[PDB]
Design a protein around this nucleic acid. Structure first.
Lengths: 117, 55, 167, 51
RNA sequence: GCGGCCCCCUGGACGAAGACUGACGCUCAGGUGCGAAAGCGUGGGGAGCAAACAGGAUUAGAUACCCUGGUAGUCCACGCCGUAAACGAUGUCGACUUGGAGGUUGUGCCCUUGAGGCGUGGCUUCCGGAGCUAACGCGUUAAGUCGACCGCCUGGGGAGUACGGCCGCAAGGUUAAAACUCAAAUGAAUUG
């Protein structure tokens, strides 16, 4: 619906997270999905197969509109990040951008220390 | 050499992002890259080249 | 059952505020959920008719998760407790062990006790039963016996106490 | 870091920019902070790889 | 111990030729100052995560190894504290003694003619001669041969504590305690 050929695909691959979100310029909700919402509770959520199944999950949740291409907000070096896009780019549509928006803070804050393992 | 007004020539020594290329690749003398880095930072202050290319 | 996985001809649909919507087509509910911009979860598929509850997706998800999670933490705080006892007991480290054991028991945790007999006690089970009685003797009003030992398994003993509950 | 990636490649080809961003250092500082140790660990590859 | 860019004071360091003073030098007992971080006093802040502390999982467990919060605290203002594996585990100053491969900094000349040689200093690493060492190793910046002057050591544990004194209300810091016990604690190097 209302093809514009430009939009945003926010993706964030974390150690226990990987998601895709679809929106246009303004940001009224269009589509999104969560790997945790796809199941895979435990150490399975961000796994590449869970990553890619959530990817085609989000894609299917957003195929209703049929617009040609968007931007991809690539974020998070967590597990996956490739099976996600590999399931996404396989949609057949055109892709416009790949951007690792993950900032480079320069002496920002002191992070935690406790974890020994 | 001691100049800073050759941003076109200076652009050869920066990355696509404009990041600071070590002499390990370029092979320039340390004295020269010192002044070059000074000039690059000052140009960055003047917004001739951005902090990074995603701006 | 999600989206097209729903197969029951008639389902019981209730509104967000709890109004009785009766039995309606799944298409209208799916359209309302899609406009509601979130995911769809069905609770009980095996019921006839299946029960469907509509609330914003992870709002209700993690609210019920909070309820279950706090109910899980309602159970007693679990470390693991086990301190051995030996008949070859000295003067004060006896009290050290006794204080450790009562400290762990006052924590209200499950019982876990292992007792090793010193060597040749299999022919001298009298000292073992006597020291066990003395444990009962020193825990007359302090501990309660659940099972009385009659058989020796290797060099230790399998026995479980019970917590004193105010009844 | 913004690039206009297209269909056929479908994978990577951003090694230079990924190395520049280098999320590993921020991941490591996320857990524990030291301020001192890496200096000792270095100066070994150059010293060893000579013959 | 010191790293973005600007503006005021600047012990140093070496290269050049010249210049004039004419021994004016070294260690320096006590004495004097500086001095990692934590911490303690009065004023503002907590993005930061974490001391304690709060919720959970855990084996033979002992507040434990991981999770979610979290106070001091770290930053500027003044004072105190003066200790650290404050180690190159090498007190300071001067003189002599095989050779090589480095970077780094500078002047002189001749082809700067590109990215050569020359004499430069200070450090840097790898070497390794002789020599020195118990060995490991060190090895023109010697742990080589000498010179001059301070500091410090005399078995182990007892013990950097007993006391006194000194300094700091504060935490503590320097001077140093025997009786008793042991026949040993050691350092480097060969087979699993």
């Amino acid at each position: 619906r209302k093809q514009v050929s430009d939009g945003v695909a926010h993706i964030h691959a974390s150690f226990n997270n990987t998601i895709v979100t679809i929106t246009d310029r303004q940001g009224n909700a269009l589509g999104w999905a969560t790997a945790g919402g796809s199941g895979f509770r435990g150490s399975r959520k961000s796994t590449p197969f869970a990553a890619q199944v959530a990817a085609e999950r989000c894609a299917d949740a957003v195929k209703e509109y049929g617009i040609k291409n968007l931007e991809v907000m690539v974020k998070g070096p967590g597990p996956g990040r490739e099976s996600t896009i590999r399931a996404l780019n396989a949609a057949g549509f055109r892709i416009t951008n790949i951007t690792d928006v993950t900032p480079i803070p320069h002496n920002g804050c002191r992070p935690p220390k406790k974890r020994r393992v | 050499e001691i100049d800073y007004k050759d941003i076109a020539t200076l652009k050869n020594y920066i990355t696509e992002s404009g990041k600071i290329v070590p002499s390990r690749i370029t092979g320039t003398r340390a004295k020269y890259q010192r002044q070059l880095a000074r000039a690059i930072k000052r140009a960055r202050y003047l917004s001739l080249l951005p902090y990074t290319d995603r701006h | 059952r999600i989206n097209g996985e729903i197969r029951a001809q008639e389902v019981r649909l209730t509104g967000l505020e709890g109004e009785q919507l009766g039995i309606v087509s799944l298409r209208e509910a799916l359209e309302k959920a899609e406009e509601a911009g979130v995911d769809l979860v069905e609770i009980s598929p095996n019921a006839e008719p299946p029960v469907c509850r509509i609330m914003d997706y992870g709002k209700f998800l993690y609210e019920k998760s909070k309820s279950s999670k706090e109910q899980k933490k309602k159970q007693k705080v679990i470390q693991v407790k086990e301190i051995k006892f030996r008949p070859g007991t000295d003067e004060g480290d006896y009290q050290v062990k006794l204080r450790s054991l009562i400290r762990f028991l006052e924590e209200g945790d499950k019982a876990k006790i292992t007792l090793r007999f010193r060597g040749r006690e299999m022919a001298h089970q009298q000292i073992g039963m006597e020291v066990l009685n003395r444990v009962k003797d020193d825990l007359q009003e302090l501990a309660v016996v659940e099972s009385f030992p009659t058989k020796i398994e290797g060099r230790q003993m399998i026995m479980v106490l019970a917590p004193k509950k105010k009844q | 870091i913004k690039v206009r990636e297209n269909e056929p490649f479908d994978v990577a080809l951003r090694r230079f920019k990924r190395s520049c961003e280098k999320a590993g250092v921020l991941a490591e500082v996320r857990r524990r902070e030291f301020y001192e140790k890496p200096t000792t660990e270095r100066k070994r590859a150059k010293a060893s790889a000579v013959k």
